[PDB]
């Protein structure tokens, strides 16, 4: 007995399904790390992480919500990405699309 | 991607199939329903969702929550879910998918820059706790009914006065002016009831247009059946409920002659199993009523070993009785009865009573109301197994029907339903967070009309607020200005057109009640049961359809020493 | 330890009672509020124990006797009660005539 | 039918010709009168008589009491009698016959269903205490002045200030102001006390215009014969009364000169025995005058067998004096005189001093003002045996003209009669009731305008309020609004008229002083002796007509090591 | 006559040319200037000055002051100076010589019959504190703060929330509104930030119309360059300030991009060395910048040998971070850095820091403000000997550089410099009363608007207030209405202008903030050094010119283990 | 004593300590509360002592073992933190997983 214990069941949850992914290699050229959010419109992340940010536009990590990925200084890993969904407006961010898309 | 259900639990909270274990007790519950888009729940922190352009949109104040509950498992009457809690205005706005419309599918509470996040992941949210049932003997009753998770607080009294000790009156115009004053320096939803006992009309009358939203009668000042008519008529026409405390010696006639006196009108039968109260032994077969809406008065729930030792003397100090002389001694014997204590908790299990209350400091522990009503359920489990109505392997319907006597029931019964009772939108915000290992027991948060207004706190110094030593302190919610924006003062609807509120300058929001002469037993959530039940007069046993109904005491229960200091 | 207010209250009870406890071992005779007192925080602690209300109210009357208290203590306090958490919950213990 | 008086008294309380105990004392007070008609007494409970056409009529509230004290037993400065007490819209209604008048014979005070009742079988009720000595030196001074049973406290100060911890000052207009502001949060009825030590007079009216009912003359800020004349000319113009603290140093003469800057003018002579402070080492001569209203701090009342050696430390640490240094210890000697100190105790009981009084945190104890006054008597009644004024075998005219000490008298000399000080009808029902065994020392009830406002509560939580622990905890009535509404602030009928409640938005009810100028020693009930005494200036022996007054120190006293923890 | 100086020092406090040790520290401070004529200072009591015709005047109200403090050691940015100190209006008068002009000379500050005297002779006196970066999680952190010194509070919070215990942002209207009604009940000076965290600027406009006097940038809401730079463009035409705590995970950029955002505006940086927020590993560099006036938070202050393993864990536990999983301890790595923390102490002792706070429960000490920034200043002269500004064999130049940055600069800093922040004539009158041994630890008396709103207070019933047990305890100055009018609530001048006080019916006096927009770091009193700092992106080390800064961590330290019971 | 509020409050948590270590002292298996506040209590005085944070991080881990309390309680305590002044000031210990 384990007072409030849960009984989760087993097996696994799918996220983010039916929506539109793509992989992208990301290269940390900076000599500080940075770590990106979940929900981040990943082709307005730091200027120091080179990929392919035309290809990005318009998506975020297809990681759980509320975690985030890392980058070490020269750090060079694939990610996968989701695309926004909603009105598909962002926001914010570095100011760069500030309207729909 | 894909995670685990185990790693998503941890993050997220449980979601659909999962079971979570009731504090300490054999109740589990499992989740019927998850609102939520997976890969979309909002999570609030350092480089989580809720967050500028992403979980958190560009609205204005008006076009977005002023507070939202993240990834919360509702359990209330209507079910046990998985959803995030949008608060707006001190109200309850809606139960759904929270977050950003502009990146977001299925957004249906937006968040903006306008909005207070409270992380409810891992915990379980319920409406505030109603207590009909209060003798206003303190004001520190308020503060420790809040701690316990109730929010509102409904019955009479003037302080520590003979009074006021033995009955749940607020007697006349100048104490209910005076009591409703002191109420705005309370915490907690506030309603009264005044002296119900006189055959003279307009001494009720004036009662209610004074502002007390219920009558009580009470055998101390007299429950004859002139008085009892003479209450019930002035009920039906100010729409007001009354509560009734039967006479227990049988002076003016037997339960029978009080239920003719009642004649088919309603009326809220307080403490139905007769301990703290009525007809001796049989004031229980009113729950066989359509007009009587009963209740239990919690030192009887449940039935355990040091029940009746602890009564009987309970009694006799409170009436003041002289243990030697037998001819008191026969008249405690009357009232106490392992009988009747043992089925009351079966009724309940079988919803035929619909109520839970204390009886504050007169036969009753103010701030063991929900504590108490979950103990009952966990030993009508372990004795009488899964109810008929339960579906799947867990305990929801035992839960769902438990939970309402405490919340919905009492705020139908007395007519406030509209304003709290349940968690629906438009009702006040009166919310209630648990951590599932200290349900019903001890809450982590206590949330009144939208804002915190009492929660456990550590070292004030410290730097954090988790350090030792933890224990409940008033938060901003409860103070001056902004506790009386987020409680209220409940009126008889007399009262309110009489301007009462402006003549007396009461400072909290004002509420009305209505609809107390129209609820009857049918009505009660889930706990609608009039059985044909019968009490024998030598053997004091009860039966329904003939059947024996008792139960067995307990010698531990769980919600006990492994979470007090004392 | 999410202290309730009730559980803080039981707290200054039980300080009461250790200054008489200290008191009694120095040999002295107790007076009103410390023979409440102590007696009080006996009864909780068999609470705690597991001890039955019925014990109770009869080991009660045996904490201290009439030569242990001032005089007049004992017709002061016609009786004591207390409530603790009991392995079955919250429990009301009164003793009748506690010091004789 | 017939029933023993044992039988009787512990059922209604005693009747007359029974005598009881003043707590643990050698006082014995005998109930002279009992205004009930035996058979008819009213009292509560299950099948008792306050019921609906029985104790209880059909009356409108208009036409009944709002409160009734069952079976009190009274002790007031004109009485020690049986009755039932009624109150009506705060105030007191009738001293008499409760009940019914449809089935009841010879009933004064009619009960009905807006009436709240307290059980005063077995207990005695006393008026309010009046503590005219204040240093507003902490706000946390006024909860335990009503503990102790003080309803009322007039005095002067501003906080923790060195002006305050020395005089009972609240200097200017803008410190009354603020001072008049916060005794909106305080339970007991309050007046100020402005800085009279000034030679020009307009700088007192603006203090009076302002708000304060009084003014004290204080050596610190120069108790000299022009500030003295001053301080009494506007107090005749503006119907105020003058607290004075004379010349201990015997600067601007000695005490023959300030009685004659007095000039036969009314004044309240503060700690008139010397040691609180005064004209080394004659100043208690001032007694023997008219126009003197004399009165004592408390710390000097009785006197024990530690009195001295407190007091010569205590002055030493409070007026900051070196103890090695001989100049300083010689006047620490002129104040503290075991001759006069002694004298007191007697003056008291012949009645040449006629009030007590604290000197709260300033050489006197707050919460021991009615303890000490009883001691007093205990302690005179011991050595002195019988005064002689007293009828039968009791000490029941003793018991009249020390009680009067603390109530009547104070509020005589203070212009507040009209209000408060004594239970007679019309007054503001500021009452507290008591237990035998603890009287003077620890009420069971104190009640406040018609309302409870403190009184013990044991566990919140508990099934019953009697469970341990058991202490002193505020209820409605000292509750916001409901407070304000039971509590008075007295000011001058100067500020009354200029509006200052209006203008700084005063919350509490308001009451106007008047009559301080015309009070004089013959007015002072039970307590107007005016004796030929004299004071050795060498030896500072009392005399009274050429007799020696004097008394011996107790080693032990009732009321104190039998009831407290500390 | 003549007088040697010890016993002048023992009489009046001490003059010229002495030195006084500050608690238990090596910092001394000399006696710069003495504003008295000697012969002629005034002092209370029994004979003493402060008397009618003597050192008290004959002067109408308007014309003498309401509070004097006498003899007073002034310890302010401006200097340590001996004087008097008349208060009037709840606002400081002069600073001068007190007394009366008829007998007396250089008589600046009229003492008459309407002042009250605190007497100040072998106290130091100060401003009250500024803490400009709260965490409203709870109430009590404001009788914490107030009991330390600390007499206004800004930040931000809507109580034991999760926004709040992670930012100091009170999120849109229905929120702010609410604790602008809540701030009444509190005795302390506040005004509370909003989100600033949108790239819509009317939800800001909103939030500033609403009441906020100034916006929170947080990175757990997005501390992204749009937000930004939408924060300060509103911040720039409303006249309101915005509090900075920037991106850690360098997420949209690195602390240049930030500081590109910025783009020359106005800002206030909190905790800039980064433990408890920013940019890793450089937030640092800002301190560099004219336009950027940085501050620190407590738990770093000073460097001691706990330091690192205490912040380690609470970060850990704070943000919520797993141990074992190497992924979140590298981000555990890149905030908590030996190389920042020591340097800070160092860039605090060279005026490169200006301000320090709390961060009050969200990584911060709120009652250790004050104590924790002596304790650097301990440490720096230990470690670096005497600064380069100072003058003659003491540590007042440290001691005044020091002092502003919890008084002066957050004034400064947040726009209500007019109304506190130091003792000048015209602003409220917040002091605090230090005895030497307990300078920075334990008040004397803390001042609220020229009442005393917190003291040490002894036995309530004792002769007087210095018995056993001594603790802190709310005075006048903090109870109902007194409290309203010795308190400030800041607004914006949007707010102010729209009727924000009236609407929610604020009690308290109001006050609105300017020249947020135009402070620099120039303007920081004392603290204006803007050195060519530098970070090692890979070691961490601190750099100013080249020369590395750094300093030792301290295994003792004063104002501790000495002066509290746990 | 001039004792501010955090200081009384820490009295609190001391009693709470005293009513915990008379129990255990019975032979009693300590509850939920009972175990915060000895552990509690015990790194208090670790840090007046003058012990490291990093030494108390671990000695508090072995104050009560899982067989000296209730069953569930060692879960219902993932950690307990308090702070104390240390001769360095006020310093925060938490200790993980203190019952085992
Ligand atoms: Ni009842
Ligand atoms: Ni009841
Ligand atoms: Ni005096
Ligand atoms: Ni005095
Ligand atoms: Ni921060
Ligand atoms: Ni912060």
Redesign the interface.
Known sequence: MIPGEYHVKPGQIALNTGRATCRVVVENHGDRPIQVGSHYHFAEVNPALKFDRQQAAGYRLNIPAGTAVRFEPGQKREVELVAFAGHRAVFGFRGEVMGPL | ??????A??D??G??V????????TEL?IEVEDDLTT????????????????????????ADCV??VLTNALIVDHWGIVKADIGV???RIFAIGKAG??????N?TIPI????????AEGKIVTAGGIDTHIH??????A??AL??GVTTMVGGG?????????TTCT?????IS??L??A???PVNIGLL??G????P???R??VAAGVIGLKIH????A?P??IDCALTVADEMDIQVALHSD??N?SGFVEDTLAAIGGRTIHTFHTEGAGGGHAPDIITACAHPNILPSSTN?TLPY????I??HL??L?????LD?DIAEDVAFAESRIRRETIAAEDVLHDLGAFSLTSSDS????????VIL?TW?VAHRMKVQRGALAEETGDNDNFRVKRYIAKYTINPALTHGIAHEVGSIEVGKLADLVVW?????GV?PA?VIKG???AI???????????????????????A????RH??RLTFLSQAAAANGVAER??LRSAIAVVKGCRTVQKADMVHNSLQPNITVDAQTYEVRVDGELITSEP????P???????? | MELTPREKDKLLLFTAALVAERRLARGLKLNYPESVALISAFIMEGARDGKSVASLMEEGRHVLTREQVMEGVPEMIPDIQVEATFPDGSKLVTVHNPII
Request: aromatic share 8%; with cysteine; charged share 20%.
């Open positions: 991607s894909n995670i685990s259900r185990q998503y639990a993050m997220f449980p979601t199939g999962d079971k979570v274990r009731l504090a300490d589990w997976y890969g979309e729940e909002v999570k609030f922190g350092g480089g989580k969702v809720i967050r500028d352009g992403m979980g958190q949109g560009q609205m204005l104040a002023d507070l707006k205005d001190g950003n419309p502009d990146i977001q599918p957004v903006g820059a306008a909005t207070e996040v409270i992380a206003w003997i303190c004001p520190q009753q503060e420790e701690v316990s003037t302080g520590p006065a003979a009074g006021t000790h033995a007697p006349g115009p100048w104490y005076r009591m004053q002191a705005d320096s309370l005044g002296k006992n006189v055959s003279q307009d001494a009720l004036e009662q055998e101390d000042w007299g004859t002139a008085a227990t010696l002076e030192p355990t070993l040091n029940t030792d602890e003397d309970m006799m100090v409170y009436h003041h243990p400091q007169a036969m009753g522990r103010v701030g063991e108490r103990q951590s599932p290992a200290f349900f001890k948060t939208g804002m915190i929660a456990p706190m550590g070292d004030i110094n410290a730097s954090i607020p988790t350090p030792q030593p933890v224990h409940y302190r008033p938060m901003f919610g103070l001056g200005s902004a924006h987020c007396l300058n307990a010698d531990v229960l919600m006990a020493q492994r979470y007090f200091l004392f």
